[PDB]
Paper text:
Human leucocyte antigen E (HLA-E) is a non-classical MHC class Ib molecule homologous to H-2 Qa-1 in mice and Mamu-E in rhesus macaques (RM). HLA-E exhibits preferential binding to a highly conserved set of nonameric signal (VL9) peptides derived from the leader sequence of HLA-A, B, C or G molecules. VL9 peptide-bound HLA-E complexes engage the natural killer (NK) cell inhibitory receptor, CD94-NKG2A, thereby protecting healthy cells from NK cell-mediated lysis. Whilst VL9 peptide binding and NK cell regulation are ostensibly its primary function, HLA-E, and its rhesus and murine homologues, can present peptides from microbial and autologous sources to CD8+ T cells.
Author numbering:
A (entry chain Q): 1 to 9
B (entry chain D): 1 to 100
C (entry chain C): 1 to 274
Write the structure that this text describes.
């Protein structure tokens, strides 16, 4: 499954 | 910004023979950015029922797509693809060779 | 053998036409199984492999929410990177994200990776220890410090080493009848005379899975040949792949040339002539 939270750049 | 010209392959899903249904594929890969115009031609005429795969990319971040349609190869009929990308000075036409 | 679960995220800003286009696809080995495209009123994650159609609403609702949240974050990231490089809002830009995990032959975690790209170039990379980042310039170093502020390397390492591995096991079981099935290439040689003195021998490999394959032309049973035309492996459209290798040989000497095919679906390499 997808990662729950995407990183902020 | 880095841009990449697309690589193009036109081919059939199966070994083509006249009067037998098949799939005409146009494989575009190694390009960047993702915006690209791909057309499939029957005797220079645009084919309408054309589908394509979902956008993906390789380790070098260059994208690839598979454009395909159902067709029946014959002797008289020529098949090609028109590819237009921001990196190209003009649209590129690649004819279909059933031996390739 | 090794298996992998890979996701590929692409976000492209649209100067005068609204929110950025966002597309995410997932692959198990060489097989795509899900897709998300935000170019809809209420975009959703959908199956792209037959063995995924047995998932209940709990899975698709969760993946849809995750993908929608990622699209919003990437829209924020595209605005941030635009400010880093002092770029105008009239220009279209691309942000890419790839991540995945690989299993060893024992089925346990082998390695993981995560990478970001901006406008076709590396931007921020998660190092091989999965504990530190590598920035390409001063702009990405700001992103690195932000990542350090959030302990992001730890959160992503937890995803790659645990969540990714657990769900790859789930996918391999659901699609075992095709994911764990090696398809050998069906091979043959074609002959195309170029003149009275030379001819082309083209060695075909059709309908194989996975995509890794090696085609080599050998003369007199001795190693390598000099002038071989090799095409990039290409998808057939049905889940299998294609490739061919061509060599120009003197007419009458075609029996000296042998094509060698290496592929996981073959217990031993295959040798063929025209």
């Amino acid at each position: 499954r997808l990662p729950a939270k995407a990183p902020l750049l | 910004m880095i841009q990449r010209t697309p690589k193009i392959q036109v081919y059939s899903r199966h070994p083509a023979e006249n009067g037998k249904s098949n799939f005409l594929n146009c494989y575009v890969s190694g390009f960047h950015p993702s915006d690209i115009e791909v057309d499939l031609l029957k005797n220079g005429e645009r084919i309408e029922k054309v589908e394509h795969s979902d956008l993906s990319f390789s380790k070098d971040w260059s994208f690839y797509l598979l454009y395909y349609t159902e067709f029946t190869p014959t002797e008289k009929d020529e098949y090609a693809c028109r590819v237009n990308h921001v990196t190209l000075s003009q649209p590129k036409i690649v004819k279909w060779d059933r031996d390739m | 053998g090794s298996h992998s679960l890979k996701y590929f995220h692409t976000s492209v800003s649209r100067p005068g036409r609204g929110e950025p286009r966002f597309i995410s696809v997932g692959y198990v080995d060489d097989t795509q199984f899900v897709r998300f495209d935000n170019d809809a009123a209420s975009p959703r994650m959908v199956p792209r492999a037959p063995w995924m159609e047995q998932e209940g609403s709990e899975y698709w609702d969760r993946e849809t929410r995750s993908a929608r949240d990622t699209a919003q974050i990437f829209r924020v990231n595209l605005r941030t990177l635009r400010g880093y490089y002092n770029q105008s809002e009239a220009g279209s830009h691309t942000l890419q994200w790839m991540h995945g995990c690989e299993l060893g032959p024992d089925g346990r975690f082998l390695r993981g990776y995560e990478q970001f790209a901006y406008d076709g170039k590396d931007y921020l990379t998660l190092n091989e220890d999965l504990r530190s980042w590598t920035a390409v310039d001063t702009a990405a170093q700001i992103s690195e410090q932000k990542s350090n502020d959030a302990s992001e390397a730890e959160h992503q390492r937890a995803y790659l080493e645990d969540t990714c591995v657990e769900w790859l096991h789930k996918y391999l079981e659901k699609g075992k009848e095709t994911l764990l099935h090696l398809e050998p290439p069906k091979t043959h040689v074609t002959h195309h005379p170029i003149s009275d003195h030379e001819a082309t021998l083209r060695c075909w490999a059709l309908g194989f899975y996975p995509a890794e394959i090696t085609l080599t032309w050998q003369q007199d049973g001795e190693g390598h040949t000099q002038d071989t035309e090799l095409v990039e492996t290409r998808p057939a459209g049905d889940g299998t792949f294609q490739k061919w290798a061509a060599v120009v040989v003197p007419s009458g000497e075609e029996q000296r040339y042998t094509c060698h095919v290496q592929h996981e679906g073959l217990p031993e390499p295959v040798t063929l002539r025209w």
